[PDB]
Paper text:
To investigate the structural source of ENaC trimer assembly, we exploited a set of constructs, deemed ENaCFL, which comprises wild-type α and β, and N-terminally eGFP-tagged γ, and behaves like wild-type ENaC as measured by electrophysiology. To determine the structure of ENaCFL, we expressed ENaCFL in HEK293T/17, solubilized in digitonin, and added two different Fabs, 7B1 (recognizes the α subunit) and 10D4 (recognizes the β subunit), to facilitate particle alignment. Reference-free 2D class averages and 3D classifications reveal that ENaCFL channels form as α-β-γ counterclockwise when viewed from outside the cell. However, the transmembrane domain (TMD) and the cytosolic domain (CD) were not resolved; we speculate that preferred particle orientation, air-water interface denaturation, and intrinsic protein flexibility and conformational heterogeneity contribute to the lack of 3D reconstruction of the TMD and CD. Therefore, we did not include the TMD and CD portions in the ENaCFL structure. We observed a map feature located near the β-ball domain and the β6-β7 loop of the α subunit, where residues αGlu335, αAsp338, and αSer344 in the α-β6-β7 loop have been identified as important in Na+ self-inhibition. The map quality in this region is estimated to be well beyond 3 Å and thus the positions of the side chains are reliable. We speculate that this map feature is a cation, perhaps a Na+ ion, based on the surrounding residues, the above-mentioned functional studies, and the presence of high Na+ (150 mM) during purification. The cation interacts closely with several negative charges: the carboxyl group of αAsp338, and the carbonyl oxygens of αLeu135, αGlu335, and αVal346; all of these interactions are within distances of 2.5 – 3.5 Å. Furthermore, the presence of a phenylalanine adopting a different conformation in the α subunit from the tyrosines in the β and γ subunits, near the cation site confers a specialized function for the α subunit as the primary Na+ sensor.
Author numbering:
A (entry chain B): 78 to 131, 139 to 167, 179 to 481, 486 to 512
B (entry chain A): 114 to 166, 183 to 191, 223 to 541
C (entry chain C): 80 to 133, 152 to 164, 200 to 521
The structure:
Amino acid sequence: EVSVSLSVGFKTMDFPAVTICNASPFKYSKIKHLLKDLDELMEAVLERILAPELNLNFSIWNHTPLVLIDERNPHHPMVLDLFASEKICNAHGCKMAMRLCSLNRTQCTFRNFTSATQALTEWYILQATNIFAQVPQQELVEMSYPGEQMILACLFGAEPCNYRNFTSIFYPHYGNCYIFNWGMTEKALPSANPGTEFGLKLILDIGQEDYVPFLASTAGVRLMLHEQRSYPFIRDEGIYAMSGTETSIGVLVDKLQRMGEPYSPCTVNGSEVPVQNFYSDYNTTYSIQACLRSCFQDHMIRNCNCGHYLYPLPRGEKYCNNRDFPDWAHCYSDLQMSVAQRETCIGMCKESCNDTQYKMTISMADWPSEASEDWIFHVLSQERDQTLSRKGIVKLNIYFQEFNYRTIEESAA
Amino acid sequence: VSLNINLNSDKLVFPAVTICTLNPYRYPEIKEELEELDRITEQTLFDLYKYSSTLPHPLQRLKIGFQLCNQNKSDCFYQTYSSGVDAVREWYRFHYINILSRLPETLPSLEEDTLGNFIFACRFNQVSCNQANYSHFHHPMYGNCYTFNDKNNSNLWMSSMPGINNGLSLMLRAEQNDFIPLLSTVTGARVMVHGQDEPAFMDDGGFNLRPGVETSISMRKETLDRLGGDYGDCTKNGSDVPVENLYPSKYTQQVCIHSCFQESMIKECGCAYIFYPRPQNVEYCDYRKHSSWGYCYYKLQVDFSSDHLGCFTKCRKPCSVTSYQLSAGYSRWPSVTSQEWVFQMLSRQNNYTVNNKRNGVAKVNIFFKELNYKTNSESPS
Amino acid sequence: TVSVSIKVHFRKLDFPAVTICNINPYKYSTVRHLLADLEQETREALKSLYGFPEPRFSHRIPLLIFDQVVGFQLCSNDTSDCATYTFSSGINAIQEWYKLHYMNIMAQVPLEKKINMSYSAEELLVTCFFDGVSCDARNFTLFHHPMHGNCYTFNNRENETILSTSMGGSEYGLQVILYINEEEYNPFLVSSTGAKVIIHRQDEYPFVEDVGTEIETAMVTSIGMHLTESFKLSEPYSQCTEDGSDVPIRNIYNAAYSLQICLHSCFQTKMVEKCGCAQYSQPLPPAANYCNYQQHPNWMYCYYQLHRAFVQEELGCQSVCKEACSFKEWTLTTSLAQWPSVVSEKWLLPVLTWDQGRQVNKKLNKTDLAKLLIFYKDLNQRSIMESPA
Ligand SMILES: *[C@@H]1O[C@H](CO)[C@@H](O[C@@H]2O[C@H](CO)[C@@H](O)[C@H](O)[C@H]2NC(C)=O)[C@H](O)[C@H]1NC(C)=O
Ligand SMILES: *[C@@H]1O[C@H](CO)[C@@H](O[C@@H]2O[C@H](CO)[C@@H](O)[C@H](O)[C@H]2NC(C)=O)[C@H](O)[C@H]1NC(C)=O
Ligand SMILES: *[C@@H]1O[C@H](CO)[C@@H](O[C@@H]2O[C@H](CO)[C@@H](O)[C@H](O)[C@H]2NC(C)=O)[C@H](O)[C@H]1NC(C)=O
Ligand SMILES: *[C@@H]1O[C@H](CO)[C@@H](O)[C@H](O)[C@H]1NC(C)=O
Ligand SMILES: *[C@@H]1O[C@H](CO)[C@@H](O)[C@H](O)[C@H]1NC(C)=O
Ligand SMILES: *[C@@H]1O[C@H](CO)[C@@H](O)[C@H](O)[C@H]1NC(C)=O
Ligand SMILES: *[C@@H]1O[C@H](CO)[C@@H](O)[C@H](O)[C@H]1NC(C)=O
Ligand code: NA
């Protein structure tokens, strides 16, 4: 029997950690030399599907051939490879799939797709990850969006800031991310005044001209509010922000403190879990999401002798490439599309007794006005260069509402 | 104590809606004082950023920021900024606040149709609210504000059934060309829903609006009731708190905090802050009357944020805490098949000059998501 | 005495039903012959009242000029009392007057013809995706709404298991691309352009107009939701009812019991007893007919008096209806961003129109395709149970 106590209001507390990731993982102007043969092959696949009437590198195509499954004839289903109308079928009985072979093109499986716009994205991501897994990280970070050009302005209340106050990490899905107030080296900045005037003010530059065409579709900027010593999982808990608007974000710290171990299966420190944490290089606190990615990466190395690119890699292991482990495409597919292994890891991982959420309300408005667009863009371009349009500049106003916390504490009674 | 969560199925009174525009109206009284301020800013941009379109605190590059000092010019410190956008905005704001306190203390005598030019249509629960009593006040950072369904209005808006059809429907005008481009750098409008008696804190619970989209705002009412005295330290009045309530409203957490900070602003710096109400005798701040008030205000925030003034300990929490969660659903309001007659209708009635580049006018819908709002009440055990 | 107990669970939870629906009910080129005289009479009101430079319709409810204020009045048979509606805005008066006749012209059209004239599952949907496996139009159940045409729910189909998500994130959830043909929008009926969805259970009736959230037709909308369940004691403590067994009101929605469903069913039942016709905005009770000025000329004032007595609690619906004990809720977190970038638009639109080739002959525009992401940010299922003490 535990007692539940609710207390909402306003109090002085530390400002949430603001993680800033760009939509595209890398700049196309600095990575086109690495994705030259892939993009040249992707344009050929588009021409084969869109306008068939109107050299290539088949070493990339033979890794995962995008085939067409024409099964509208129940007595004769056929599978045709893309590489007197010569159009490609798009009727109700036809479909497009990816042929994933395991051992010498014998144990080949099909990842079926109904629309071509989805199969082309999944095929390009699988081929791009194959190239991004065989390049060192020290070289893979410099070919992404730097913090000097993204963060054009930073003003937390009355104290200014710049790209040097943002901790730079490399999220393998969104490239270089920047955390405003993390708290690993210096103490977290508290805020005791609600309102946009006392909150965080940011002016970000989203360069859409350097986006990867076949990899990054959305032209926004990812934002996440998390704790001070927690790893930012952008794909799970992450919001967007339109380009050319002022996104006001009112934060509300909604906490829930569980009773303890003898009353609920929750951990405090996080060292009681059996699986080892692969995020130990960041010195962050325990997180349930970090345990779900450490088990999957451990199961990934267990089946095939390689680790995925979208997850941390232990010391001594190697990422999944095509020149070393050609079976990683079938290996990763059998582990991603498997609800059985997902349920096993959830049972092994435990939750934290003190969880924290941020019930944030998003309100946007067109920031660059017709009267202020002249001098604003002239100042920002003068500081960056010595290139900016409505699609580039992003305005963010993060702050606390009238009530900034809502704690639900459980007490033994 | 013991927490008891329940749902109240009663006639939901519609909260007061504060509608503010995003362009501060420059008064003709301070037109000569503002044109001089713009000339100093245009000269500042041309000297620093070469942008071609005597004040006590000039903006200079050292970063870019203005110097703040005390009376005897002993503890001088520079308030620097990273970019010129934030530097010019805050520097213009500081001088705009000082010259805004020089306005006369008399009531306006020139009745101008300032509401009809902003609100193109009002309709609550299939009933027009164009001819309704409201309260007008000019926010420094934002524009003119209009609060509807206030305590002073006898006709209280009652929401019978939840949904968009039985809620507030507004159509505001987002002026693309602001009166002050050096300070107003955002187009749209703000809407804040608060209690019938509670004041309007546009910085705390403001909700921006994009020009040219229909924003259906769903309100979820959340209230918390707790006992006071021996069970808790909450207060159901302002007599228990020694802080004098400066707002003409009931007791609230932020109302007492703003009042407690304003008293410390008057005792130390000698002048009252503009963004907060003032008593009948103390006047607002101005660099001509008070030689140095920005330095005293900056150092006051340092002591206030460190809980040195004691405003967080003196201001207790109210026993009745009501909140409104806002969830919006956006959609482009001008349809390509209706821009012909809709934009032409506004040009005939409201004389709205249609602009093919940007939309301008924006529609807003406010309503309750659920009729049974959650009520959290505590009970002894 | 009761005691609340808030406990969270982390496991594979079920995915709710997403009632995707376009705000434009029917293509204007399809229902032009039904609304031909209504469109002509509407434009004549613009040139007369506002002075523009320039199933049958009833001329009994015209637009008049009351003392620059325009509107219309709804009188009774004896013409003793008239329920008038005044308007201060021009666009607001036309949309309300057009919708008044639109609800009466479409009420005398057979249901089978209305479903055929609205959008299909393959025309409204361009791309379906959920938890890796790609879905199609067969995975959506038809749901005809009188205002939004045909709505399609992702889950909630008969003789099929409920889809459940086991990995949180925007990629392992619902990822649909909607086709919103803005060129065939009704000029006077609907003002904005876009789609709207409703997050509900498989046994809950989706209220599109009440608790529906609109979606912009030009950009992507990511909706992160958290499941929050609540349970309350029924008989001795809160007097709440479960499964709708204690209340004698018949449920005409054919779904689970709710307070809004009980009030609407009670108002519909009281309406058929008062006047011979039933309201068109709500589903039709058994052995009844919809309302229209052609067959029921005195229903505009009949509904006015009933609604006037329903708010004042005089019909007897708020006292008999009781709140439901248990119910779920999804705290939606909406986030918008430009879906087609300047560079990806060159290859997305030509491919997105290749999938929808039979329904669309030209190239899809950026303002016609709306992408939607609905998923669980976390698998934390917060349950609030009230145990007796
Ligand atoms: C992808 O689709 C193909 C074809 O629709 C599936 O393959 C078939 O499997 C069924 C039953 O196992 C057989 O009756 C067919 O003869 C097979 N056809 C071919 C061409 O192999 C395949 O199982 C699907 N894969 C997934 C993961 O859904
Ligand atoms: C951004 O970082 C700079 C330094 O990297 C901070 O400047 C320091 O601020 C502290 C206040 O705690 C002073 O004690 C130091 O003297 C300052 N150092 C320098 C070099 O000026 C700045 O405060 C940070 N701003 C934010 C918003 O975090
Ligand atoms: C959409 O419906 C189809 C069938 O109506 C689903 O396809 C089945 O998928 C399961 C996998 O969970 C297979 O075991 C069955 O053999 C399939 N049957 C058929 C007839 O194809 C499909 O999974 C549904 N889509 C989603 C996203 O759930
Ligand atoms: C095809 O690409 C691979 C790596 O992407 C490269 O090693 C190979 O040389 C390329 N083929 C040709 C013919 O250039
Ligand atoms: C959660 O609250 C408990 C209660 O005091 C505290 O001991 C614990 O440190 C908190 N968790 C974190 C991560 O600070
Ligand atoms: C200047 O004034 C401050 C406060 O007003 C005081 O602390 C300081 O001693 C003064 N300095 C001199 C030299 O008078
Ligand atoms: C609370 O204050 C009001 C006026 O502010 C006063 O009329 C009332 O008597 C007070 N009640 C208590 C219990 O102090
Ligand atoms: Na503005």
